[PDB]
Amino acid sequence: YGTRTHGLFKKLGIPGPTPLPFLGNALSFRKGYWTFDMECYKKYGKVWGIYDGQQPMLAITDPDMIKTVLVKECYSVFTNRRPFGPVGFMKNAISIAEDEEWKRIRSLLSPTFTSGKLKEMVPIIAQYGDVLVRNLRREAETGKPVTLKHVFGAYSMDVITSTSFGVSIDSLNNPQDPFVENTKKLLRFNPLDPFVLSIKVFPFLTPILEALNITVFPREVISFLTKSVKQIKEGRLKVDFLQLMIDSQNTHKALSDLELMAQSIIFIFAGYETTSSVLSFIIYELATHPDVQQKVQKEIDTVLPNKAPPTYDTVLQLEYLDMVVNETLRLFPVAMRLERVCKKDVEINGMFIPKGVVVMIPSYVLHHDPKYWTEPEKFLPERFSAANADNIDPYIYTPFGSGPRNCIGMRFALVNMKLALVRVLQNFSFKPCKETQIPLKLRFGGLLLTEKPIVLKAESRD
Amino acid sequence: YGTRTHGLFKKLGIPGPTPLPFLGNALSFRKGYWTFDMECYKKYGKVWGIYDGQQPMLAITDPDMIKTVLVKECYSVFTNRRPFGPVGFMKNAISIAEDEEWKRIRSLLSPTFTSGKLKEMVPIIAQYGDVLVRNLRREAETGKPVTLKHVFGAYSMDVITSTSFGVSIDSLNNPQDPFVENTKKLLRFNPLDPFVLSIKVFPFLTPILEALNITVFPREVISFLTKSVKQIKEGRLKRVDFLQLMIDSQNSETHKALSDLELMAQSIIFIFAGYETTSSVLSFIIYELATHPDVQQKVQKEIDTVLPNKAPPTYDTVLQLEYLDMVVNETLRLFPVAMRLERVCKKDVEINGMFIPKGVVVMIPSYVLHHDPKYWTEPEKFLPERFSAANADNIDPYIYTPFGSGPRNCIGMRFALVNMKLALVRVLQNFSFKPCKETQIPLKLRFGGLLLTEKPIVLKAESRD
């Protein structure tokens, strides 16, 4: 059985590495998606095929073909991401929903994510930057090297859990909060636990598992979180994501109470580790590039002198900080790849793609490709200067994806990271210490991970 | 899921090759079980551990340990073979049955395999020797090379199908016989078709399949064969083959009789157990005679002494062919066509100083132990004299196991040895064998459920006088 699809790419003449029975090419992933994808690009060229168990995946690098997949043919042919598999009510989560159901949910949610509602949301979220400074100061004053994940992760989880669930939380300075302990538990679910990695090898189990109400999600942890958010909703009727969705419940039928909870949960899964990782990578680049850090601090000092609290409108003016964030995301696109399932046979941009193949856009490869970037391993924020905008193809540079199924939280994530970076750089200056892994090494994971934690030394300003 | 047992040999201090998720070490078998077992013996020592999918298998080479597994702790701990998996009524076949069910059917079949009953069966079986000679004469007389499998396969099938189903068949000279075509279709099933090899990667599917009455065997053929045997059973009601002996047994002692359905299952399993084994060994024996002309001559000399002037072989005369027994035994040493024995460990135990956990399969590498210089002098040389009476105490019966050992050993051993001798006598009374341009020397083996040759064995056969 373990070989039935393994002839597909050879029959179509798409190059690729030879798959093993049952495993496909999965063992080759374990050195990291980013290195495996690049190796395939270097040796097979513009297009290649691989197998993740029995699932074939076609890699594409042509920006015209990528626009066709991500944009033009999104609703018709390439509408859904790969299942993973047995879920329950989390079928309603915007990132898991498919076809017409996804379209309704993305539509219901678009009001919640406008820049206008974001601007209204900032004053409640600037508060969490104060906790970050408190947490960082407590770690950095002892003279010790700081583990960036500890404080930036706490900031990421505090901000996204608070606005998604409607509950101010402080994970470090109040770890006994049930919400902290439970949300922490929730976040233990990784798409790389041995349950998911077995479903990929025999995906025919999902129908049986769903017939038995088995889910890959922590059923108990979600049961408590739902039963707790129920009480908040009933008390609140006597500007976070929870309120915005509540307000939208009165073309598409409004969100059900169950559909809303699925959104709140998926926001945390989507926002926690991405934002945490990217914040750490940004500070790492700043530490290893003093004069870039110096120029960020000068600019912050210009718009927000004397540790003035950041606002939407002021953060919106940190154009250089924007370039620094954009250049960090080129080097470390934490999702690595984009994926779409082909719903039917098509020929696009000179290539036939059979039904059921997963199209894969290797963002990391395109971000690091010398064809599109000079010295692509160099951290040069100037690539994202206003004047170099014509030379950046939005199908080559895709840290938040593209098209109708892109990151719906991109604008919130950028502002949120700038709010935190401002606070922290208003008060501190980062520098490599003894334990800092330089150059940084990456490690296998669902997202871009570091081999060893990023440790720097943080010095107070004045 | 794909590694759930893969730490087990590490955790026990037992060495072995690093297994892959889901597959275990299975990709390494495809070069041949015999060559894989020997490689593991060389580089890992007396004991080693492998994984066939999720199933851990422990190889042992110590005769004392082998004798604990095969003999002492057989009914208590090492009772059953590995399943393969979904089977229907064939659960009653002796080789597949387990625990008290196996103990029952093996006891009901013991009367049928006594040497007395064997002797009463030879007058009926010697006939297929004449058919064998006729088929060989037709191929050999043109002076062409003869493909040993073609006549020896036919003989083995004719013999085992005739005595198991109770009809005389002649596969070559009457190939449109419906029994021939169906038995040939039945034997198409091999323990290596991809269905049984996917069940090994996910064994939890077997209960599902059995709930759906799905079977790994060809239900098609077994249906027609059962209906055919039933008509035969009524004609006899108004006579010494395996069918009769199991019918007669149907007439309590320590166990209830065989049901008609249990009887059919044994007839089917007899053909699976005896067809390809008997064919391959007969060809290996003729290959050794052709490549060792003196041994052939000495064998013929003994045959002419006991059965002068082409006298037909009988049970009492074939019993007198002491040197022919040496040849057969030496051939089976070089070519133990089963390669290995296996037993499932029913429960935790510690035998001769080694702990073995529940659910492991213990494996005895017969082929490894037959070619092991630790126990044989020049083990690659074909020397029939290791089995002379003067050298009886030099043959450890847990090192030399072409028929297995203990209560779960090959119940057809004695029939097999006599059946082969009946065949070799007729053939060696009428022909001498010689290598030709196409005889692969030395013989190259190939991967399979039994020991197979790379290329078919092809020899020249000259008639005597």
Ligand code: HEM
């Ligand atoms: C730096 C932080 C983040 C990064 C780098 C990131 C990256 C991505 C990427 C690459 C995708 C796939 C888009 C595609 O396939 O085209 C995605 C999807 C998504 N992200 Fe983000 N994300 C981040 C933060 C967030 C936040 C804060 C939220 C919510 C508040 C969020 C919610 C989502 C959702 C719901 C989807 C699925 C969209 C859909 O299927 O309609 N993400 N993200």
Ligand code: HEM
């Ligand atoms: C050259 C011929 C043959 C060889 C080399 C051979 C070899 C073997 C071996 C190695 C075993 C496994 C024993 C163990 O696991 O300890 C076995 C089992 C068996 N053989 Fe034979 N065999 C031959 C012919 C036959 C014939 C002709 C029959 C039937 C008349 C037969 C019936 C069986 C049965 C029923 C079993 C399973 C018995 C049980 O599990 O209790 N075999 N054979």
